């Protein structure tokens, strides 16, 4: 087994990323886990000539999973893993009755990283009040998290996966960082059956949500109208307000009829025959997907969510802002659901499209920097940015 | 001595090759007193002669006072030079350091000058000493330790130490040392002897590793003033705050007021500088006297009070929960105090930050919890549990109707007025019986004039003309005329989402004249009702405004 040469163009330098504070059981947890992976070779002490840094986590059941935050330089060596080596996206893989998720990131530890390339790697252990230097490390094999990992590693998971796809030619399995996604539209039974006979093909060769995910079963959320049996001028303002926004993204919204009726908010107005025939016309319009929106390759996924209180939250996928590609919902505090939402909404964009979106987060930086950690389950972390939350944009999405 | 740890590798920045930097002629004392301090450096082996094939030079430079110092311009090569990792992080709070029987400073005596350099990087610290008018060719010198001033030296001096450390920190880890620069600070709960025996054991380690130290003769002792603090056995304080006595106040000793002042709140309880770095706001001439507002004497004569008497801090004890506790001291405001025991503070601060353009106190404080729980993570690595001045209905209350998630760690209700509340409350539907004002605002975007106004269900009309406003202005002075024109109960609807968004956030403080004036009317209210319908859709009420409001040129 030899290296496979990593390039990050003639230009552009690593990543020199500052480490968020660690709390003291995290910080311990990690000195555990890199003790035996430098003991194992995985990893090296460096010295002070290494001027990178990637950012180090630890996650959780019982037992700590160290997780490093490689989006910088996944970001950064993007010709490598997506132009130079792409691991291609099957669209049936959103059209089976049943997708089972496996980590498989314990596979990288047995492939060595080409020697030019490990010093893009460095992450810090970071010591409680500044009072020691900082434990400095690289990877000496393909890292966790790295885009380029499972790009390198492809062509041995091809070799693992050869008999199980012969034996089985309607199971779509696609490799996502850390992740196999493996889809069939066998019963749960035969389809658990399957998922532990590819486990055992995998032991040979070293290896929200719920059990399983329903793809087949992923519906969009409608922009859902009020049925009401009386009607008040606030209401019809706040049902123009709703379709006019809607008219925006769904071609064929008419408000026309809505709006023909100085008055008071708390005044009762009766529902006319053109304006309920409108309304019911819209309705329909609402339940099919938008038309003339498609994903572009080359375009990033973007990610909306308002939380709508008592422990509801919304979200919206699309490219090209308000053109949704995907609308949907997610059912203790107010970071925990924020987290696991994003979670469930990743693991979806993952599925249909073979990216993850860029989030626009309703939560302060500090906030939501300081507590993800507590909750987060997944192997891998999307792009997100702190944005405020336009107070119609939560009323319109129900 | 040079240090026999093994050499750190040093490489030149990609597309670039060493110095090639001319040596300027020299005077004779300047190559006299050059001469004398290389031959005894290269007498130690800090420095080696080299041919006349090497062509990468630096230029070197000597200062004077009775003693002679070589100053190398290592401007280019620093230039040159790959990056280095961040030497450290940060600085130690002395509020997160746990108690030590004794303790002992150590200082590496020639630090940079006792550690290797890589021997494929020796070439690129080249120098010449000029002949008397640069007749005859020069002496030519390298460096086979650290150079003074070069880029490389901090790091690779931290990182040697650390690794000549790390031996005696595994066989003693009871024993806590911290390094910083040429500074080795040892501390252990060992008695007086003990203590004295492991010091020269280390002493000892680190001549092994050719770093000198000041023998037992030589060291500091009663009580330890470090990094601008002063740390006694059981107690520590800030290093003494001098608040000078002065008639007039130039924006130099106003900068540095607020400085120490900054520094004293890291102990002091209820520290204020807002008003004095209100005074710093206008950008003037730093010998500029600045004539102190009453407001500012009032700040200073406070802060003098909270000086007058001496004020300590505690050390930390892991076995021991932290409590952090938060007060309001006047607008926008905060004042905090960390403790395990109570009131005997491990440390003391504030915040006073305006994170948008309007904000209210349950948002404030809020922030304020933010900003203590990532510091005690620093300091402590656990968050501490909080004693808020608002009520747990309040909170929730604010919580679960805010669009924004927002989460606090476990804390308690302390009755410490002032008390956060929510000033006023927005209705939840159309209120009956009640006057519905449709506003507009329409600002020329040349002419910059404006026009705000409104239509009522009860038949009123007015509008009013502005100078110098935005469409964001006019479309707020609009709702402010609703609320100024309109009894206890209102229902009021714009076409602005501007507006809408900054009121329906429930501020109680703003930035803008015009948000404290809509805020100073909300407050008053009994019941207001504010609705959103979108502009130009030929919506009964909101075109009649139109109309009136867009009426020359809109
Ligand atoms: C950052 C730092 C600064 C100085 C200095 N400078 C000394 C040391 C070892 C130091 O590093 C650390 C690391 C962890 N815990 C502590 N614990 C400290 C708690 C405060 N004591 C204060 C103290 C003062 C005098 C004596 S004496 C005069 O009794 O030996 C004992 C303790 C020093 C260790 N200090």
Same mark, same amino acid.
């Given at each position: 087994?030899?290296?496979?040469?990593?390039?990050?163009?003639?230009?552009?330098?690593?990543?020199?990323?500052?480490?968020?504070?660690?709390?003291?059981?995290?910080?311990?947890?990690?000195?555990?886990?890199?003790?035996?992976?430098?003991?194992?070779?995985?990893?090296?002490?460096?010295?002070?000539?290494?001027?990178?840094?990637?950012?180090?986590?630890?996650?959780?059941?019982?037992?700590?999973?160290? #997780?490093?935050?490689?989006?910088?330089?996944?970001?950064?060596?993007?010709?490598? %893993?997506?132009?130079?080596?792409?691991?291609?996206?099957?669209?049936?893989?959103?059209?089976?009755?049943?997708?089972?998720?496996?980590?498989?990131?314990?596979?990288?530890?047995?492939?060595?990283?080409?020697?030019?390339?490990?010093?893009?790697?460095?992450?810090?252990?970071?010591?409680?009040?500044?009072?020691?230097?900082?434990?400095?490390?690289?990877?000496?094999?393909?890292?966790?998290?790295?885009?380029?990992?499972?790009?390198?590693?492809?062509?041995?998971?091809?070799?693992? #996966?050869?008999?199980?796809?012969?034996?089985?030619?309607?199971?779509?399995?696609?490799?996502?960082?850390?992740?196999?996604?493996?889809?069939?539209?066998?019963?749960?039974?035969?389809?658990?059956?399957?998922?532990?006979?590819?486990?055992?093909?995998?032991?040979?060769?070293? #290896?929200?949500?719920?059990?399983?995910?329903?793809?087949?079963?992923?519906?969009?959320?409608?922009?859902?109208?009020?049925?009401?049996?009386?009607?008040?001028?606030?209401?019809?303002?706040?049902?123009?307000?709703?379709?006019?926004?809607?008219?925006?993204?769904?071609?064929?919204?008419?408000?026309?009829?809505?709006?023909?009726?100085?008055?008071?908010?708390?005044?009762?107005?009766?529902?006319?025959?053109?304006?309920?025939?409108?309304?019911?016309?819209?309705?329909?319009?609402?339940?099919?997907?938008?038309?003339?929106?498609?994903?572009?390759?080359?375009?990033?996924?973007?990610?909306?969510?308002?939380?709508?209180?008592?422990?509801?939250?919304?979200?919206?996928?699309?490219?090209?802002?308000?053109?949704? #590609?995907?609308?949907?919902?997610?059912?203790?505090?107010?970071?925990?659901?924020?987290?696991?939402?994003?979670?469930?909404?990743?693991?979806?964009?993952?599925?249909?499209?073979?990216?993850?979106?860029?989030?626009?987060?309703?939560?302060?930086?500090?906030?939501?920097?300081?507590? %993800?950690?507590?909750?987060?389950?997944?192997?891998?972390?999307?792009?997100?940015?702190?944005?405020?939350?336009?107070?119609?944009?939560?009323?319109?999405?129900? | 001595?040079?240090?026999?740890?093994?050499?750190?590798?040093?490489?030149?920045?990609?597309?670039?090759?060493?110095?090639?930097?001319?040596?300027?002629?020299?005077?004779?004392?300047?190559?006299?007193?050059?001469?004398?301090?290389?031959?005894?450096?290269?007498?130690?082996?800090?420095?080696?002669?080299?041919?006349?094939?090497? $062509?990468?030079?630096?230029?070197?430079? *000597?200062?004077?006072?009775?003693?002679?110092?070589?100053?190398?311009?290592?401007?280019?090569?620093?230039?040159?030079?790959?990056?280095?990792?961040?030497?450290?992080?940060?600085?130690?709070?002395?509020?997160?350091?746990?108690?030590?029987?004794?303790?002992?400073?150590?200082?590496?005596?020639? /630090?940079?000058? +006792?550690?290797?350099?890589?021997?494929?990087?020796?070439?690129?610290?080249?120098?010449?000493?000029?002949?008397?008018?640069?007749?005859?060719?020069?002496?030519?010198?390298?460096?086979?330790?650290?150079?003074?001033?070069?880029?490389?030296?901090?790091?690779?001096?931290?990182?040697?130490?650390?690794?000549?450390?790390?031996?005696?920190?595994?066989?003693?880890?009871?024993?806590?040392?911290?390094?910083?620069?040429?500074?080795?600070?040892?501390? +252990?709960?060992?008695?007086?002897?003990? @203590?004295?025996?492991?010091?020269?054991?280390?002493?000892? @380690?680190?001549?092994?590793?050719?770093?000198?130290?000041?023998?037992?003769? &030589?060291?500091?002792?009663?009580?330890?003033?470090?990094?601008?603090?002063?740390?006694?056995?059981?107690? =520590?304080?800030?290093?003494?705050?001098?608040?000078?006595?002065?008639?007039?106040?130039?924006?130099?000793?106003?900068?540095?007021?607020?400085?120490?002042?900054?520094?004293?709140?890291?102990?002091?309880?209820?520290?204020?500088?807002?008003? !004095?770095?209100?005074?710093?706001?206008?950008?003037?001439?730093?010998?500029?006297?600045?004539?102190?507002?009453?407001?500012?004497?009032?700040?200073? /004569?406070?802060?003098?009070?909270?000086?007058?008497?001496?004020? &300590?801090?505690?050390?930390?004890? $892991?076995?021991?929960? !932290?409590?952090?506790?938060?007060?309001?001291?006047?607008?926008?405001? =905060?004042?905090?105090?960390?403790?395990?025991?109570?009131?005997?503070?491990?440390?003391?601060?504030?915040?006073?930050?305006?994170?948008?353009? @309007?904000?209210?106190?349950?948002?404030?404080?809020?922030?304020?919890?933010?900003?203590?729980?990532?510091?005690?993570?620093?300091?402590?690595?656990?968050?501490?549990?909080?004693?808020?001045?608002?009520?747990?209905?309040? =909170?929730?209350?604010? =919580?679960?109707?805010?669009?924004?998630?927002?989460?606090?760690?476990?804390?308690?209700?302390?009755?410490?007025?002032?008390?956060?509340?929510?000033?006023?409350?927005?209705?939840?539907?159309?209120?009956?019986?009640?006057?519905?004002?449709?506003?507009?605002?329409?600002?020329?975007?040349?002419?910059?004039?404006?026009?705000?106004?409104?239509?009522?269900?009860?038949?009123?009309?007015?509008?009013?003309?502005?100078?110098?406003?935005?469409?964001?202005?006019?479309? !707020?002075?609009?709702?402010?005329? /609703?609320?100024?024109?309109?009894?206890?109960?209102?229902?009021?609807?714009?076409?602005?989402?501007?507006?809408?968004?900054?009121?329906? *956030?429930?501020?109680?403080?703003?930035?803008?004249?015009?948000?404290?004036?809509?805020?100073?009317?909300?407050?008053?209210?009994?019941?207001?009702?504010?609705?959103?319908?979108? /502009? @130009?859709?030929?919506?009964?009420?909101?075109?009649?405004?139109?109309?009136?409001?867009?009426?020359?040129?809109?």
């Amino acid at each position: 087994i030899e290296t496979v040469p990593v390039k990050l163009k003639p230009g552009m330098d690593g990543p020199k990323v500052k480490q968020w504070p660690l709390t003291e059981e995290k910080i311990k947890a990690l000195v555990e886990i890199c003790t035996e992976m430098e003991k194992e070779g995985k990893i090296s002490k460096i010295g002070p000539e290494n001027p990178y840094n990637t950012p180090v986590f630890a996650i959780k059941s019982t037992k700590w999973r160290k #997780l490093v935050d490689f989006r910088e330089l996944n970001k950064r060596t993007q010709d490598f %893993w997506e132009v130079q080596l792409g691991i291609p996206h099957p669209a049936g893989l959103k059209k089976k009755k049943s997708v089972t998720v496996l980590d498989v990131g314990d596979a990288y530890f047995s492939v060595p990283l080409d020697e030019d390339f490990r010093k893009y790697t460095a992450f810090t252990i970071p010591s409680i009040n500044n009072e020691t230097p900082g434990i400095r490390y690289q990877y000496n094999v393909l890292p966790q998290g790295w885009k380029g990992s499972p790009a390198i590693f492809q062509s041995s998971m091809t070799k693992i #996966l050869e008999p199980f796809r012969k034996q089985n030619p309607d199971i779509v399995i696609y490799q996502y960082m850390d992740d196999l996604y493996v889809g069939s539209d066998l019963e749960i039974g035969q389809h658990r059956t399957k998922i532990e006979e590819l486990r055992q093909h995998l032991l040979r060769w070293g #290896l929200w949500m719920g059990y399983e995910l329903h793809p087949d079963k992923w519906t969009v959320q409608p922009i859902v109208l009020p049925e009401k049996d009386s009607w008040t001028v606030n209401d019809i303002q706040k049902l123009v307000g709703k379709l006019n926004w809607a008219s925006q993204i769904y071609p064929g919204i008419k408000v026309r009829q809505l709006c023909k009726l100085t008055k008071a908010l708390t005044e009762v107005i009766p529902l006319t025959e053109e304006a309920e025939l409108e309304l019911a016309e819209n309705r329909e319009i609402l339940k099919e997907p938008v038309h003339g929106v498609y994903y572009d390759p080359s375009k990033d996924l973007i990610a909306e969510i308002q939380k709508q209180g008592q422990g509801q939250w919304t979200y919206q996928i699309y490219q090209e802002p308000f053109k949704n #590609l995907k609308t949907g919902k997610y059912a203790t505090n107010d970071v925990k659901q924020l987290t696991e939402a994003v979670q469930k909404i990743t693991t979806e964009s993952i599925v249909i499209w073979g990216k993850t979106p860029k989030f626009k987060l309703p939560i302060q930086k500090e906030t939501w920097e300081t507590w %993800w950690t507590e909750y987060w389950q997944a192997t891998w972390i999307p792009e997100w940015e702190f944005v405020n939350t336009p107070p119609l944009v939560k009323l319109w999405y129900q | 001595p040079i240090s026999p740890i093994e050499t750190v590798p040093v490489k030149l920045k990609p597309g670039m090759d060493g110095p090639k930097v001319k040596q300027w002629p020299l005077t004779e004392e300047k190559i006299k007193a050059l001469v004398e301090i290389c031959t005894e450096m290269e007498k130690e082996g800090k420095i080696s002669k080299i041919g006349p094939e090497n $062509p990468y030079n630096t230029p070197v430079f *000597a200062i004077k006072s009775t003693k002679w110092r070589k100053l190398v311009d290592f401007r280019e090569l620093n230039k040159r030079t790959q990056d280095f990792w961040e030497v450290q992080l940060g600085i130690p709070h002395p509020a997160g350091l746990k108690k030590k029987k004794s303790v002992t400073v150590l200082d590496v005596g020639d /630090a940079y000058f +006792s550690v290797p350099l890589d021997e494929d990087f020796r070439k690129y610290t080249a120098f010449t000493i000029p002949s008397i008018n640069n007749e005859t060719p020069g002496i030519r010198y390298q460096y086979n330790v650290l150079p003074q001033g070069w880029k490389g030296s901090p790091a690779i001096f931290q990182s040697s130490m650390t690794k000549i450390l790390e031996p005696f920190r595994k066989q003693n880890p009871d024993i806590v040392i911290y390094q910083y620069m040429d500074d080795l600070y040892v501390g +252990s709960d060992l008695e007086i002897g003990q @203590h004295r025996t492991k010091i020269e054991e280390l002493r000892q @380690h680190l001549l092994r590793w050719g770093l000198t130290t000041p023998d037992k003769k &030589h060291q500091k002792e009663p009580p330890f003033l470090w990094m601008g603090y002063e740390l006694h056995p059981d107690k =520590w304080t800030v290093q003494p705050i001098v608040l000078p006595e002065k008639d007039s106040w130039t924006v130099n000793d106003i900068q540095k007021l607020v400085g120490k002042l900054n520094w004293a709140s890291q102990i002091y309880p209820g520290i204020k500088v807002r008003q !004095l770095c209100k005074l710093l706001r206008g950008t003037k001439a730093l010998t500029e006297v600045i004539p102190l507002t009453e407001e500012a004497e009032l700040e200073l /004569a406070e802060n003098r009070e909270i000086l007058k008497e001496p004020v &300590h801090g505690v050390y930390y004890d $892991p076995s021991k929960d !932290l409590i952090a506790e938060i007060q309001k001291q006047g607008q926008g405001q =905060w004042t905090y105090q960390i403790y395990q025991e109570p009131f005997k503070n491990l440390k003391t601060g504030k915040y006073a930050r305006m994170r948008g353009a @309007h904000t209210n106190d349950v948002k404030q404080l809020t922030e304020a919890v933010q900003k203590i729980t990532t510091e005690s993570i620093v300091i402590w690595g656990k968050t501490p549990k909080f004693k808020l001045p608002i009520q747990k209905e309040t =909170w929730e209350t604010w =919580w679960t109707e805010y669009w924004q998630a927002t989460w606090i760690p476990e804390w308690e209700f302390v009755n410490t007025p002032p008390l956060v509340k929510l000033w006023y409350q927005l209705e939840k539907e159309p209120i009956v019986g009640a006057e519905t004002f449709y506003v507009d605002g329409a600002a020329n975007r040349e002419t910059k004039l404006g026009k705000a106004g409104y239509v009522t269900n009860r038949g009123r009309q007015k509008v009013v003309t502005l100078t110098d406003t935005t469409n964001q202005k006019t479309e !707020l002075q609009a709702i402010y005329l /609703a609320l100024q024109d309109s009894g206890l109960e209102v229902n009021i609807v714009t076409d602005s989402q501007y507006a809408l968004g900054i009121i329906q *956030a429930q501020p109680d403080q703003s930035e803008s004249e015009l948000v404290n004036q809509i805020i100073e009317q909300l407050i008053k209210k009994e019941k207001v009702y504010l609705a959103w319908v979108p /502009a @130009h859709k030929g919506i009964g009420g909101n075109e009649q405004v139109d109309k009136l409001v867009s009426a020359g040129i809109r």
